[PDB]
């Protein structure tokens, strides 16, 4: 939720409960992390050497090995602290939304006709296909599709906003999520999901799931870290036969300390934390994802595909206009519009029957049982007509009316095209109502653009993402809406087959494709797009076919999705570069310290002017232990991604992190050695 | 002296980039499966006679073909060296080689290493130096050019499954890139004084009154392909110090040009096949910057030279010990960097007699994987591994999926690249460790102190990285040394060939994504510096603790 942006990393309440979860990670759950399993093996080895040297082993400096082993255990402790902190923040964000199903007061109907049934069925005894009647003030038990009634529910417990959203029967606002409070009159809801397989449990499996599979970028980074661990283990283990000939061989504890200081422990301990922190930040951005693979797929996105009615605009388009044409009087303005849209459950149809009726008191028509048979609305046909009697009343926009009715000889005249164009100038959806070969005229549907999305589309253009509209509506008012919204281009009069064709064409070029849709007709589009974002106000088919589901109903949520998906990869790469560049100063600290009795001439390599060999090794190990806990906030927050050019971004990240990993370990080791000398421990 | 060295490096790189661009354009035709002008018809009759149908084969069949030819040549060479007393063209009566020496110098010449633990004039006959150790000089070079041809074909082909024809590639390379060039190079060597004959050893009544026996043989024919294929297998004990092998400074300059000729032409062809010359220019810049820094460091170290020379009463402190008088310390330093960065291994001078700092840089240039203007084929597909790590890191730290030339770099070729870049540091570290705990490996040590471990490390590095250059103070004719180095060469070539082959087979199936605005450019000074830093850091973080007990300890002692 966005009512609280993020829980504090150190609130002094979960820190003590997740530090106790570290000692539970000390036993061999480290088997799945090879770098820190190497650190664990070295820590146990150094502890055994320290105990044996206290008891009866040949060397005598047991305190040095004890301190080395203690700090190597502290390194594992801090790595598990980072992992447990990320997982505990994830579990806290989970528990903040898992307690939304407080009460279970659902009545299961036997017939869906608004009443004649009242039960006391708990919400856990509801399956797919159970009609539920909810009065206002109650909460919604199940994630169900509304089949009757219109109400303004409040999805506060899911979205985090106080702004009510209206739900209706069919069309766009048919699907509602359970656990939310209806506020206005009533709703008849029919559940479509089994227990366990719900949207709340999808969020649960997203965030609190500790069995998180690794994304292929994390897998390849882990492979690279394993290769670095192998070369450093070999270069360290071969030092004993190399230095054994030229005098006295180096101590095994010194080799283990150098091995831990060399292997990428900084990224090795935070790699598990970066993914969980990214998913937690995505929960902070109100995006519900199936897995982190689709989240990281947003880094390569350069084209984005919205809609017009549901996505960019609110989708209501409730309006009442007239027809100034020949043969059409004031009664004739809406004699046929209400007749065509009586049995129409779309928001446009109900807006017609509640707006064009009150303008002239046209409530003469009763219920459609009195000799009326209608046809359903389908985007393939683009028509919502009715065969009420011998002559029919149909409702299309530009081409459906032509290709279906106007090929019957009675072609429509030109005098209505100018009025259609005048309607489309203002940004209203034109519906043309026709009586057989005679045309009544056109009515307008003023749709409101959602918020100030022009700045967000400018940001998307700045990030190198081409935002182009797909819609199946008239080309002129779609052009006006595109000009008012600020998108790059548009493609109007598109069937869902054409949407799929455009997605496949853009994928065949070699570009990753992002789709943001909400309607039922957008389900094959979201099932084929690489990065599919589903609107919360949309339909269950779209929310189940899309890879990700939005919550706060922002059309430009790809900005936050791209930011977080890029931030995870950039954090991983920057921490890897920092860990690799630290090894230069680790070498400059340990190699003259390690070879102080074998080759005394190597003391000229002590460019840090460190006090003692043991002090230098201890300072390097202490810095290795402390850099992980100092970079815990960076792993949790992610790096500061600024939308620059790729080359400029590489230059800035190199300048910060590679140069930092080359320089600040020198300062850190020198400061730690100075504190050790001041305290007198060495 | 600094101006003389600058002029030498400048004219060497200038003549190299002038000469290698037409050869790169010629090799791009062989990569693109287009016959060279005038070769059509001849190739038709030759392939019909040899049964080569010119059929496209996948990575498994290409790798199996390369490995099968390399083991067939290994068997032929090994039994030829064992039975060299029963073969003609033997003016002396040198016996057949022992099993250890024969296996070592068979695997060395098959694996493009050409390490010689023997003396050529008193070890092998003319047949053993001509029908073997020169046929393998051609074939080991062709078997690397074929692998880099397959890798470039994989990088340039879209959604295919077959690389090419290994037999067509090998025949085309050996008959039209290697033989017609090494013929002219050998003729110039005979012009300047190199041997080409089959006479018996010539007894000499010297001026003073002593006796010496001049060794003869087909020297120039082997020397030309030795330089051209980056082989490094000298006819005599001194690879390029022998006046019968490297008579003049013009000959030595042509030797350096032949060493860097095909590795530079392969980068030019890599640039030309993709249609983006900037990629090959990026590779050449990344190689040349490291090469110039290494050359300058080695020249300055050798000019500083022995500090004890000026104290003992000589004219200067210049280290001319272990160097020829025909070549300055500048020329010897440049050739020493060339032959150890290029995986050649032919010595103009005694790298043992080199100073500590001037011998450290050849070690590390070998140990980084021979990627800086490296071996033929292997200096480009070894550099592509560092390119894949560089693009992986860069794509991560800019926030995109890693890619090079459009093709994404996913988990499979990330594993394969990790293994390929992992094989040779593993081999050199385990080999040097095994040599330093065994008395049979420690007994070959000649110089005391850290320089003996420097000898052992240099030997294992050159064996594992297919260089073959030696300090030669290491008496590595023992069976333990022969078997260990032969294992190192075999694994160090054929455990980097197999993962690169699998990388090619994983990259043919992909499609090159179109160059968008957000994609990172894999050229320019930023990516040149990134690739240079990746190489200079990955190769250093492995070998600083190893080099610290050797040349660094010797230098600071």
């Amino acid at each position: 939720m966005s009512r609280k942006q993020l829980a504090l990393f150190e609130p002094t309440l979960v820190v003590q409960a997740l530090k106790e979860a570290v000692k539970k990670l000390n036993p061999q759950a480290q088997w799945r992390n090879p770098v820190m399993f190497i650190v664990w093996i070295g820590s146990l080895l150094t502890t055994c050497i320290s105990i044996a040297m206290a008891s009866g082993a040949m060397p005598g400096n047991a305190l040095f090995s004890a301190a080395i082993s203690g700090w190597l255990w502290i390194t594992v402790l801090f790595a598990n602290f980072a992992e447990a902190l990320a997982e505990g923040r994830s579990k806290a964000q989970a528990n903040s939304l898992k307690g939304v199903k407080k009460t279970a007061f659902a009545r299961k109907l036997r017939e869906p006709k608004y009443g004649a049934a009242a039960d006391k069925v708990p919400a856990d005894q509801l399956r797919k296909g159970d009609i539920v009647l909810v009065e206002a003030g109650d909460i919604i038990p199940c994630d169900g599709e509304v089949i009757e009634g219109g109400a303004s529910v409040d999805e506060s417990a899911i979205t985090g906003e106080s702004a009510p959203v209206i739900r209706e029967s069919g069309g766009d606002f048919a699907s509602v999520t359970g656990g939310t409070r209806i506020l206005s009159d009533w709703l008849v809801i029919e559940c479509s999901v089994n227990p366990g397989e719900t949207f709340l449990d999808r969020m649960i499996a997203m965030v609190e799931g500790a069995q998180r599979r690794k994304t292929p970028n994390e897998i390849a980074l882990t492979i690279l870290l394993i290769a670095l661990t192998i070369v450093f283990l070999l270069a360290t283990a071969t030092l004993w036969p190399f230095s054994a000939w030229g005098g006295n061989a180096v101590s095994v504890t010194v080799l283990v300390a150098l091995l831990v200081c060399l292997i990428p422990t900084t990224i090795g301990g935070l790699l598990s934390a970066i993914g969980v922190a990214g998913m937690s930040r995505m929960l902070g951005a109100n995006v519900i994802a199936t897995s982190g693979r689709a989240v990281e797929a947003a880094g390569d996105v350069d084209v984005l595909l919205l809609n017009k009615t549901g996505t960019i605009t609110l989708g209501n388009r409730q309006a009442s206009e007239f027809i100034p044409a020949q043969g059409v009087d004031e009664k004739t303005l809406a004699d046929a519009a209400q007749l065509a849209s009586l049995a129409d459950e779309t928001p446009e149809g109900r807006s017609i029957v509640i707006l064009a009726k009150q303008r002239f008191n046209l409530r003469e028509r009763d219920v459609q049982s009195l000799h009326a048979t209608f046809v359903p609305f389908t985007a393939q046909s683009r028509m919502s007509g009715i065969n009420i009697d011998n002559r029919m009343i149909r409702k299309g926009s530009v081409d459906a009316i032509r290709r279906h009715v106007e090929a019957n000889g009675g072609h429509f005249p030109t005098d209505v095209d100018q009025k259609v164009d005048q309607v489309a100038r203002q940004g209203a959806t034109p519906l043309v109502v026709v009586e057989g070969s005679r045309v009544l005229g056109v009515i307008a549907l003023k749709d409101i653009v959602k918020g100030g999305i022009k700045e967000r589309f400018a940001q998307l253009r700045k990030m190198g993402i081409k935002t182009v509209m797909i819609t199946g509506d008239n080309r002129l008012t779609a052009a006006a809406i595109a000009a008012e919204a600020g998108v790059d281009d548009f493609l109007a009069e598109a069937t869902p087959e054409a949407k799929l064709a455009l997605i496949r064409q853009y994928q065949a070029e070699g570009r990753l494709v992002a789709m943001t849709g909400d309607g039922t007709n957008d389900a094959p589009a979201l099932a084929q797009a690489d990065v599919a974002v589903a609107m919360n106000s949309g339909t269950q088919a779209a929310k189940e076919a899309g890879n990700m589901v939005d919550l706060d109903s922002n059309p430009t949520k790809l900005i936050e999705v791209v930011h977080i998906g890029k931030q995870m990869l950039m954090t991983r790469g920057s921490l890897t570069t920092f860990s690799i560049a630290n090894d230069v100063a680790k070498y400059f600290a340990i190699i003259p310290a390690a070879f102080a009795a074998t080759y005394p001439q190597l003391n000229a390599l002590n460019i840090m002017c460190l006090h003692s060999p043991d002090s230098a090794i201890l300072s390097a190990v202490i810095f290795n232990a402390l850099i992980i806990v100092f970079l815990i906030p960076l792993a949790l927050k992610g790096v500061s991604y600024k939308p620059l050019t790729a080359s400029a971004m590489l230059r800035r990240n190199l300048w910060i992190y590679g140069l930092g990993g080359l320089l600040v370990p020198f300062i850190g080791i020198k400061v730690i050695d100075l504190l050790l000398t001041v305290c007198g421990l060495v | 002296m600094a101006a003389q060295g600058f002029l030498l490096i400048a004219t060497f790189l200038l003549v190299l980039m002038v000469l290698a661009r037409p050869l790169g354009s010629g090799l791009a035709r062989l990569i693109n499966d287009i016959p060279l002008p005038g070769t059509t018809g001849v190739e038709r009759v030759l392939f019909r006679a040899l049964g080569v149908s010119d059929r496209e084969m996948n990575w498994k069949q290409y790798l199996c073909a390369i490995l099968g030819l390399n083991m067939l040549g290994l068997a032929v060479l090994f039994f030829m060296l064992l039975g060299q007393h029963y073969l003609p063209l033997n003016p002396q009566q040198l016996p057949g080689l022992s099993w250890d020496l024969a296996l070592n110098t068979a695997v060395s010449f098959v694996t493009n290493t050409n390490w010689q633990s023997y003396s050529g004039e008193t070890t092998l006959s003319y047949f053993s130096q001509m029908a073997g150790l020169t046929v393998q000089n051609f074939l080991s070079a062709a078997s690397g050019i074929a692998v880099i041809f397959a890798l470039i074909r994989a990088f340039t082909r879209q959604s295919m499954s077959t690389l090419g024809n290994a037999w067509v590639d090998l025949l085309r390379i050996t008959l039209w890139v290697l033989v017609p060039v090494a013929l002219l190079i050998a003729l110039f060597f005979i012009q300047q004084g190199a041997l080409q004959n089959f006479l018996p050893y010539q007894a000499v009544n010297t001026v003073e009154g002593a006796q010496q026996l001049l060794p003869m043989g087909p020297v120039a024919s082997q020397e030309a392909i030795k330089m051209l294929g980056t082989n490094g297998g000298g006819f005599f004990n001194a690879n390029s110090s022998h006046p019968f092998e490297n008579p003049t400074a013009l000959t030595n300059f042509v030797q350096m040009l032949a060493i860097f000729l095909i590795p530079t032409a392969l980068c030019f062809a890599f640039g030309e096949v993709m249609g983006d010359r900037r990629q090959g220019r990026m590779l050449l810049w990344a190689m040349s910057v490291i090469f110039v820094i290494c050359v300058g460091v080695v020249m300055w170290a050798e000019v500083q030279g022995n500090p004890h020379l000026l104290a003992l009463g000589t004219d200067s402190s210049i280290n001319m010990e272990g160097k020829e008088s025909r070549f300055g310390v500048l020329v010897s330093s440049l050739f020493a960097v060339v032959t150890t960065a290029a995986s050649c291994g032919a010595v103009i001078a005694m790298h043992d007699s080199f100073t500590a700092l001037g011998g450290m840089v050849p070690m590390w240039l070998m140990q980084i994987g021979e990627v800086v203007f490296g071996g033929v084929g292997s200096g480009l597909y070894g550099m592509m591994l560092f390119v894949l790590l560089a693009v992986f890191i860069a794509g991560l730290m800019i926030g995109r999926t890693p890619e090079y030339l459009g093709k994404k770099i996913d988990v499979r070729e990330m594993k394969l690249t990790a293994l390929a870049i992992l094989v040779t540091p593993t081999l050199v570290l385990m080999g040097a460790a095994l040599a330093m705990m065994t008395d049979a490996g420690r007994s070959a040590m000649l110089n005391p102190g850290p320089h003996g471990f420097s000898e052992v490390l240099y030997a294992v590095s050159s064996a594992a990285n297919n260089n073959g250059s030696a300090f030669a103070g290491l008496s590595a004719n023992s069976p333990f040394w022969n078997c260990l180095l032969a294992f190192c060469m075999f694994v160090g070539r054929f455990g980097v060939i197999i993962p690169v082959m699998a990388i090619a087979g994983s990259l043919v199936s992909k499609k090159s994504q179109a160059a968008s605005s957000g994609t990172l450019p894999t050229h320019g000074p930023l990516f040149v510096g990134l690739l240079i830093g990746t190489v200079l850091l990955v190769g250093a973080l492995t070998f600083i603790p190893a080099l610290a007990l050797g040349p660094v300890a010797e230098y600071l002692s």
Binding site: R32, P34, I223, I226, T229, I230, L233, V252 | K415
Partner: peptide, 27 residues
């Protein structure tokens, strides 16, 4: 070469084998 060298070489070999197995696997 005593037991303290033999067990060190054996443990380094075991760690290398474990790391190579972890490199090949996608655990």
């Amino acid at each position: 070469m005593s037991a303290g060298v033999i067990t060190g070489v054996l443990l380094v070999f075991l760690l290398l084998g474990y790391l190579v197995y972890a490199l090949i696997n996608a655990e």
